[PDB]
A = this chain, B = another copy of it.
Amino acid sequence: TKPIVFSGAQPSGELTIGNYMGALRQWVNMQDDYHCIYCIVDQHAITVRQDAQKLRKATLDTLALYLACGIDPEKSTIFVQSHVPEHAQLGWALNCYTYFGELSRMTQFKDKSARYAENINAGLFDYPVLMAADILLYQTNLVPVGEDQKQHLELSRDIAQRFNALYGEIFKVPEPFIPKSGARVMSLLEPTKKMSKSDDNRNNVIGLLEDPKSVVKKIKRAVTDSDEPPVVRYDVQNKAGVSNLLDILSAVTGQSIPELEKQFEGKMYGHLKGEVADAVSGMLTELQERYHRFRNDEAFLQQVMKDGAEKASAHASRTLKAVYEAIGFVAKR
């Protein structure tokens, strides 16, 4: 049987080129090599207050966007998190094997709390435990994520090991799969800040479903540096904006930064931004064309959701039963 890949994305905000390069791109390329399972994590999304109509539409938007990226429901399992109760069941049980301090130290909880001081809720704090349940339910070997999720993956490993050490080989210990390019795409006007799918300043982001012409304008206005002469060279410390642009370009074209640096020898930021906008505009145009054929076919989205929840449930129920037997619950009839 193939090793198992699991990963998820929130139906909140609007997925960006950052979400694509750090995660979805890898999701698509691993579908034959591994047994892949991809999740729309609507239970995680509501740790930030959502409008109910927005959340429903965004869940379906996200599903269609997975399909548009090339996630293939005949190859991978695609499902909505709340459709599989085992996620919440194992999440509760794993609370009891997770320490308070492991959660309080989390960068995401601290960043999100500062952004939403009016809604610092227990779900936001408990977020990593539910994520660990997401992963461990499927005997997951590889978890393809961006860099910002490293700390959460590491906790899920610590939980798997702690539980296994008491109870036996109940969980696989997952490993992160973080790309060499595009693991942390940066904001266009603030290249020291991760690109956000919920930025108040849209000029910082390249949304997957955004008008390509709007994206191309945003690329040209991306901040660079004062170097004289202007030089296309990778240096995150001193040339954050140029470096981020090179990263996006490498991640879309598959070309190395060394290659790109040589290609831009004797050129300046106009050539750099012209190729970035060309490559990204082409990607988004093709993506969006596939997207609408999937997004407006409710019967197909309904079918994918149904089959996917059924496949996931068969795996998740097996793991949960072993977990419940190990901790000592009377098994359900």
Chain A interface residues toward B at CB < 8 A: 42-43, 46-47, 49-56, 59-60, 80, 82-83, 85-86, 88-89, 91-93, 95-104, 117-126, 129-130, 167, 302, 305-306, 309, 324, 326-330, 332-333
Contact = CB atoms under 8 A, between A and B. Distances in A.
21 contacts: A43-B92, A43-B93, A51-B328, A55-B328, A59-B329, A80-B329, A80-B330, A82-B330, A83-B330, A85-B89, A92-B92, A92-B123, A95-B126, A97-B121, A98-B122, A99-B121, A100-B119, A100-B120, A126-B126, A302-B333, A306-B333
A92 B130 contact: yes
Nearest to A53: B328
A136 to B, nearest CB: 15
Q: When A and B form their complex, which 5 residue pairs have the shortest distance between CB atoms, in order from nearest?
A: A101-B118, A52-B328, A96-B123, A306-B333, A55-B328
Contacts of A55: 327-329
Given A52-B326, A80-B329, A123 B99 contact: no
Contacts of A93: 43, 46
Given A85-B85, A332-B83, A120 B99 contact: yes
Contacts of A324: 82
Nearest to A49: B96
A96 B41 CA distance: 14
A101 B120 CA distance: 8
A202 to B, nearest CB: 23
A59 B96 CA distance: 18
Nearest to A326: B52
B80 A101 contact: no
A99 B85 contact: no
Contacts of A42: 329-330
Nearest to A98: B122
B99 A328 contact: no
Given A54-B328, A59-B330, A330-B42, A99 B82 contact: no
